[PDB]
Amino acid sequence: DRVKKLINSQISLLIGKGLHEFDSLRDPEVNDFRTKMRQFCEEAAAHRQQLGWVEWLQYSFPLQLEPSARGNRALLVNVKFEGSEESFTFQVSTKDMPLALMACALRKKATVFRQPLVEQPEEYALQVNGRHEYLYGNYPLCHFQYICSCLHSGLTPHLTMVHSSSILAMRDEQSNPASLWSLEQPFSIELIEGRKVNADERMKLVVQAGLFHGNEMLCKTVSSSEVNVCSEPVWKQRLEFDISVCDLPRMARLCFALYAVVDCPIAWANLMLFDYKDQLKTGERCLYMWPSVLLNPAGTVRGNPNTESAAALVIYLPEVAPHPVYFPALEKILELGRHGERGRITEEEQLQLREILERGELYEHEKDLVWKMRHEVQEHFPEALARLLLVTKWNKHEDVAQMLYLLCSWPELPVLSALELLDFSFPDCYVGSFAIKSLRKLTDDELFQYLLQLVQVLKYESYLDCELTKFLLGRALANRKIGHFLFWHLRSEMHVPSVALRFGLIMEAYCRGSTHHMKVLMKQGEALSKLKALNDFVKVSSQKTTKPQTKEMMHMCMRQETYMEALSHLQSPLDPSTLLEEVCVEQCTFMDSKMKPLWIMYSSEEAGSAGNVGIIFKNGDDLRQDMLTLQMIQLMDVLWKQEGLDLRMTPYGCLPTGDRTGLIEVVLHSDTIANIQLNKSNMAATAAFNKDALLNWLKSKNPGEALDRAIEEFTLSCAGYCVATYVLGIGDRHSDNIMIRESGQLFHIDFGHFLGNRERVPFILTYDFVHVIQQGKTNNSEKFERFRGYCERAYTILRRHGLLFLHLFALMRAAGLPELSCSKDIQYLKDSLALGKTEEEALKHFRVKFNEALRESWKTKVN
Ligand SMILES: COc1ncc(C2=CCOCC2)cc1S(=O)(=O)Nc1ccnc(C)c1
């Protein structure tokens, strides 16, 4: 009671919505979700409380491995022991396991402390200094993301030997405190009246209505009669749909659209015909409609929360029986579908099936053949499940029972196929459950890669308690990195009234499961409060006083006790492994752009060089599209690295955290092309020609022999971003949104416009980069053509995984991004990846675009 009331107020602050509002609804669906999901999450917290010390490391500090390891050389390593400032530098091989390194550290400890030790290497974990990152398991050193980054950057790994008893003390510290088919009457509803309708009084009001099973219409859309415009329109009329009440599928939704005629659209509404407990809905309903900016089937089945102004359509769902009618059980359904005649198929008719299954829209007579051959499909082409599901007649219960009988015997599908089955175009709760079963095999690394999309799938759900929510909640409770990000993906959409109820409930369920992680997340949101307040002080001050004056005004504001306490010693929302220890106030600043984004610098004494990190607080712009583009780029880099192609990419973090608010990870020792190209006086890189400025900057940052590898880092990262921006249609590319690292790595920032946005983005080649690739020479086709090979290679690797990109982009349509909503945007990708052509055909096409970019590049060399 004493702690439960505090935990409840902590949860409420964390999610920015009071838990009392959930109870004020008096909603049974909400209440049952809160009881059931708190049971599931506390069970998980208890399971975690007893975990072994190595399993607790797997929960808190999951391994960050290189993509090639997933599923030789000398190396200097510095190792200290927890509780001592003394350290030991020693040489190891890139192929040695952490155990060998730990055993070597223990021998070099026994020889200094003159004592034959009791502790063994098996009792220790290697922590990365000043990070929530560990090195454990049977993997060679080079296979870890930390050691791998240290070899490229030439840096020395600094590890700490943490004992098993210390790891177990962290676990203890973070403890949680103690029958339908008989009804053959046509489906009908009574459109009674409307409220708060704001429309043109010269026009008349109409109510269109469709019956949907996801994207497909169950029957033709019906329309209401015209009634003069006013705040309270009255109809009191019965609308009949060409479908039997027995034929209505389980996941069927009634979609409404209120509009004016002489074509101004006013509002929309949806609802499920079956409630969460499978009962057919009866009685009067008040539908608080959403404003339209015609019928919207993919829209939310929950009403508009603002009842103080939303227009409300009043409907009556008739009583089709004297008793409540529930949806038949799986046992009753499987028996109907179990009986299903099998006919013999011709060998000439079997050639037509194998061709269209491997070929993708179908013709009317081909669907007839796909359905007839459903049994041969299940047993020889099980990967064609989604084609068959689309040919099934969801408005004819005999077909649906027959399909579900095959589904329950269907072999498990590869992850790529399951991702397709999560699309709104497959709304059956059993299809969704078969897809989740096939996704259970996803590794925590694959899960995390597609986590963003899986969160958008939750918006397509028809009911609060679903298999996907339980799967995502179960994975978040067993891996703290997944839990961290799943929290921030939901927390960032709390300002959207259509998703606030579901996301606030899922966040509450997680907080029951991890009380310690709630405190860690609160500390992060508290920092975000102070950052918003400090960015507001800057947004105002910057437009009166000069940039250097506003900087010391910001620095004094940051030096207040409330700021110094809130902004220090927290986990980075961008990376849970990165600890943000001491704010370096004098190092902080802000951009002179419209939204004045804050650049907050941090340092750590325990972490050293790796502890010096930056975060950019952005308020005013929507960070969702950058986050998606960056994840897509990082996916391309994982795909390329899996084929042994490392193109030296820079997928920095970017996380939306609230309404037009979010963080971006600063990439240090990097500058924009525009700033290097300023060609300033008295500095190192000043050149005779501007085409040299960038190569002279690389020359000053990488002296002598370092330059040759800096040019190769540039070439590889160039080839990678040329392909990525081409495939993704990233336009609006200029010198101020292209940055380069002191290492030679080139990268892109400011991903506001992608997928052509409506024009087709060509392949781009800047001659300023071509000059760096050619090592400052006018003609160097040896180096230039290596670059063209790196490009062709990168492009062909991505095409082999084009379906993965298409399925992921299809799931992202749920997010509501203005430049990603319909098939028109997904078309840009099929064109850029040339997915309908053969490899030699698509490479030939790609070669033409690269040559066309080269002709465009010579138009600036000749000048
Ligand atoms: C879209 O906005 C951003 N995107 C990325 C960065 C980064 C920078 C350096 O490290 C990797 C991240 C920063 C921002 S920003 O600071 O909000 N905007 C900028 C616009 C143009 N030029 C600059 C230097 C910044």
Curated annotation (Swiss-Prot):
Residues 584-858 form the PI3K/PI4K catalytic domain. Residues 72-163 form the PI3K-RBD domain. Pathway: Phospholipid metabolism; phosphatidylinositol phosphate biosynthesis. Residues 338-513 form the PIK helical domain. Keywords: Adaptive immunity, ATP-binding, Chemotaxis, Cytoplasm, Differentiation, Immunity, Inflammatory response, Innate immunity, Kinase, Lipid metabolism, Nucleotide-binding, Phosphoprotein, Transferase. Changing residue 750 to A: Inhibits lipid kinase activity. Mice are viable and fertile but display defective adaptive and innate immune responses Signaling defects in B-cells, T-cells, mast cells and natural killer cells. Reduced B and T-cell receptor signaling. It is found in: Cytoplasm. GO terms for cellular component: cytosol. Disruption phenotype: Null mutants are viable and fertile but display defective adaptive and innate immune responses due to signaling defects in multiple cell types including B-, T- and mast and natural killer cells. InterPro entries: ARM-type_fold, C2_domain_sf, Kinase-like_dom_sf, PI3/4_kinase_cat_dom, PI3/4_kinase_cat_sf, PI3/4_kinase_CS, PI3K-type_C2_dom, PI3K_ABD. One of its GO terms (biological process) is homeostasis of number of cells. Residues 729-737 are annotated as: Catalytic loop. It catalyses: a 1,2-diacyl-sn-glycero-3-phospho-(1D-myo-inositol-4,5-bisphosphate) + ATP = a 1,2-diacyl-sn-glycero-3-phospho-(1D-myo-inositol-3,4,5-trisphosphate) + ADP + H(+); a 1,2-diacyl-sn-glycero-3-phospho-(1D-myo-inositol) + ATP = a 1,2-diacyl-sn-glycero-3-phospho-(1D-myo-inositol-3-phosphate) + ADP + H(+); 1-octadecanoyl-2-(5Z,8Z,11Z,14Z)-eicosatetraenoyl-sn-glycero-3-phospho-1D-myo-inositol 4,5-bisphosphate + ATP = 1-octadecanoyl-2-(5Z,8Z,11Z,14Z-eicosatetraenoyl)-sn-glycero-3-phospho-(1D-myo-inositol 3,4,5-triphosphate) + ADP + H(+). GO terms for molecular function: 1-phosphatidylinositol-3-kinase activity; 1-phosphatidylinositol-4,5-bisphosphate 3-kinase activity; ATP binding. Heterodimer of a catalytic subunit PIK3CD and a p85 regulatory subunit (PIK3R1, PIK3R2 or PIK3R3). Interacts with ERAS and HRAS. Phosphoinositide-3-kinase (PI3K) phosphorylates phosphatidylinositol (PI) and its phosphorylated derivatives at position 3 of the inositol ring to produce 3-phosphoinositides. Uses ATP and PtdIns(4,5)P2 (phosphatidylinositol 4,5-bisphosphate) to generate phosphatidylinositol 3,4,5-trisphosphate (PIP3). PIP3 plays a key role by recruiting PH domain-containing proteins to the membrane, including AKT1 and PDPK1, activating signaling cascades involved in cell growth, survival, proliferation, motility and morphology. Mediates immune responses. PANTHER family: PHOSPHATIDYLINOSITOL 4,5-BISPHOSPHATE 3-KINASE CATALYTIC SUBUNIT DELTA ISOFORM, PHOSPHATIDYLINOSITOL KINASE. Belongs to the PI3/PI4-kinase family. This is Phosphatidylinositol 4,5-bisphosphate 3-kinase catalytic subunit delta isoform. It comes from Mus musculus (Mouse).
